[PDB]
């Protein structure tokens, strides 16, 4: 449970407390939930980009071996 020190614009905190007074939660409960959403969003997108990059690197292998074993598949069909 690390702990830290931040500096938010005076307007943004004023607005933030607005949504707090309304949804009946605290600042930290909201900041924490906001950091989660942002970090989940960034991690996900990063992972999607690494999956693409990998698939595109693996094309030559995956294609070759998909063909090399084509006949085996076709036989295990109407069997």
């Amino acid at each position: 449970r690390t702990e830290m020190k931040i500096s938010l614009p005076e307007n943004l905190v004023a607005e933030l407390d607005g949504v707090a007074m309304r949804e009946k939660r605290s600042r930290n409960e909201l900041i924490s939930q906001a950091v989660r959403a942002y970090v989940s969003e960034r991690t996900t997108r990063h992972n999607r980009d690494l999956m693409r990059r990998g698939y595109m690197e693996m094309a030559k292998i995956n294609l070759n071996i998909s063909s090399e074993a084509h006949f085996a598949e076709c036989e295990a069909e109407t069997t």
């Binding site: 999956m51 698939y55 995956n62 294609l63 598949e73 069909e77």
Partner: protein, 103 residues
């Protein structure tokens, strides 16, 4: 070509169901599919999903065979015949976990 998980195509000719995730279905030459046959109309296994002809525009009632899965070149996918809703894909999901012991 943009193939989507749930799309059913003809393949080079027999029907076929795309079951691979959509990221791979875009940035990869290969697609993982599950055969479809019309020699039966009812499920004979917990690895089968029935397809109604009138509901999904088939000439005759068919059954997806989640015991019959293979990865092919997307280039063999020709005509897109239809797409299965979330309901039908929840069946394919649990049939696939049984087939591959993902309990």
């Amino acid at each position: 070509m943009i193939v989507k998980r749930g799309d059913v195509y003809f393949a080079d000719v027999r029907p076929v169901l795309v079951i691979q995730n959509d990221i791979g279905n875009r940035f990869s030459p290969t697609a993982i599919v599950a055969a479809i046959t019309a020699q039966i109309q009812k499920a004979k296994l917990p690895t089968h999903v029935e397809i109604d002809a009138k509901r999904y525009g088939f000439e005759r009632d068919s059954v997806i065979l989640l015991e019959q899965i293979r990865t092919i070149d997307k280039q063999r996918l020709t005509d897109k015949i239809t797409h299965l809703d979330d309901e039908m894909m929840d069946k394919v999901d649990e049939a696939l976990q049984i087939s591959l012991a993902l309990i």
